[PDB]
Design a protein around this nucleic acid. Structure first.
Length: 476
DNA sequence: TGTCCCTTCGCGTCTCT
DNA sequence: GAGACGCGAAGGGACA
């Protein structure tokens, strides 16, 4: 091709126009993963996708387009969404979720073909079939659940929920076959329980982790002194294979030359990217603190960010290492640190918050999301809904802050004016892990019915959604 | 150069209490 | 607070 690059840039240009009104980020996303033909398909069928009986939002179109075969997915969605919705009960969101993976077309056609038999003959729910279908290779996983769910239940004593958990990852077919093949030897030869085998298999690359566990468990227990419980824990994240091999190679070095305990090495290895974290730790602080930063998903990123920003954050923004470590010791530590850097001065000034408050927000999983959302929503929360900034901060200061805030904004009016809860109590329910589910559950029970309104709040604060659901099950 | 499938890394949120 | 859940991005291999 040559200087019909112009034609393609003109096509991308017209997608910025209406019905989709895409921005640069979205165009970039489609180009990077769906390729030019996905970009051309979106342009070609932008009207069909957006109206008719599909009625897709541009965000939904982007999600389908942004994978290998995206053009096939968009074509097939136009063909199958209505029948999947009307005849099989699924919602459009679910159809989009199936379609938003590489090979989306195949998954959608297989769900059409297999959902009935899987529900009727195998007893799955539509929800489970969607979860199986909603990954790359979903066709294969669905077909393998159909062929193997009986043997895995009858001969290997697994539950359908377990089989679904193994199936609901990319390479689900591979993990299910490997479980079928290796479950007996892993239990009988290495002393594992089915549950443990399941936990190792229930992640992406589970096949690889099971074969690695079969291959290295002996060495790691017999020659390096780890327990089977420890080996399993390492193996129970995606990438387990990698973490297991790196443990074998680095355990002697990290204990001999650097003085870490075996239990510290394991804890670092037992996260997604464990291999990465181990290598990075081998390459201000106490070793306890380095381990603590390393011991999360993305631990490598956190450590390299800490090494880069600890000096400036301490010197130019006045923080202590103890605070930097606390920001870094969560999932996405790197993201929180970077954000705190570009958001301490801004939040304190445009919105009048103290540093100590900013640290409390960023010292949780999802810090970047919490801060960025406090920046957006603090003004409307106080001025419109009448909240104190200290209240907004109590809600932001937990894992899932952005969720709890965005939900509070949505649900604060209907909780107070329509059901007589005080804002004092809604803040109390939002100020925990799982604030958003807790609020939703609360509104659902109240909108569409002995547990008076105050008992429901005491329950929602204490145990969130779990407490609320448990209460239903238990009901007399 | 697109389409399908599989694996790994990382980020974000919720459950268990 | 630790351990569990979900999901997107990105890269690799096979085949056309």
């Amino acid at each position: 091709g040559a200087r019909a690059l112009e034609a393609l840039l003109t096509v991308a240009g017209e997608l910025r126009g209406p019905p989709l009104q895409l921005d640069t980020g979205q165009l970039l996303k489609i180009a990077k993963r769906g390729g030019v033909t996905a970009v051309e398909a979106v342009h070609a069928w932008r009207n069909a996708l957006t109206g008719a009986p599909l009625n897709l939002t541009p965000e939904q179109v982007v999600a389908i387009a942004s994978h290998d075969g995206g053009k096939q997915a968009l074509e097939t969605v136009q063909r199958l969404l209505p029948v999947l919705c009307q005849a099989h009960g699924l919602t459009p969101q679910q159809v989009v979720a199936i379609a938003s993976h590489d090979g989306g077309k195949q998954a959608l056609e297989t769900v059409q073909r297999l959902l009935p038999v899987l529900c009727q003959a195998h007893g799955l729910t539509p929800e489970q079939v969607v979860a199986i279908a909603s990954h790359d290779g979903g066709k294969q996983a669905l077909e393998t659940v159909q062929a193997l769910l009986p043997v895995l239940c009858q001969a290997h004593g697994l539950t359908p929920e377990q089989v679904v958990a193994i199936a609901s990852n990319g390479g689900g077919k591979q993990a299910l076959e490997t479980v079928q093949r290796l479950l007996p030897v892993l239990c009988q030869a290495h002393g594992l329980t089915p549950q443990q085998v399941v936990a190792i298999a229930s992640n992406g690359g589970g096949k690889q982790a099971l074969e690695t566990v079969q291959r290295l468990l002996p060495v790691l227990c017999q020659a390096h002194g780890l327990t089977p419980q420890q080996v399993v824990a390492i193996a129970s994240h995606a990438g387990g294979k990698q973490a297991l091999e790196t443990v074998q190679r680095l355990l002697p070095v990290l204990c001999q030359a650097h003085g870490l305990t075996p239990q510290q090495v394991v804890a670092i290895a037992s996260n997604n990217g464990g291999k990465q974290a181990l290598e990075t730790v081998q390459r201000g602080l106490t070793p306890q603190q380095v381990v603590a930063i390393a011991s999360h998903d993305g631990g490598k990123q956190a450590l390299e960010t800490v090494q880069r920003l600890l000096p400036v954050l301490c010197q130019a923004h006045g923080l202590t290492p103890q605070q930097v470590v606390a920001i870094a010791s969560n999932n996405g530590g790197k993201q929180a640190l970077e954000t705190v850097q570009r958001l301490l001065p801004v939040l304190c000034q445009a919105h009048g918050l103290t540093p100590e408050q900013v640290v409390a927000i960023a010292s949780n999983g999802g810090g970047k999301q919490a801060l960025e959302t406090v920046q957006r929503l603090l003004p409307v929360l106080c001025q419109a809904h009448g909240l104190t900034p200290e209240q907004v901060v109590a809600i932001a200061s937990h894992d899932g802050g952005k969720q709890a805030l965005e939900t509070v904004q949505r649900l604060l009016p209907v909780l107070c004016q329509a059901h007589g809860l005080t804002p004092q109590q809604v803040v109390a329910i939002a100020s925990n892990g799982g604030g958003r589910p807790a609020l939703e559950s609360i509104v659902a029970q109240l909108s569409r019915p002995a547990l008076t309104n105050d008992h429901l709040v005491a329950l929602a604060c204490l145990g969130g959604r779990p407490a609320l659901d448990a209460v239903k099950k238990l009901e007399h």
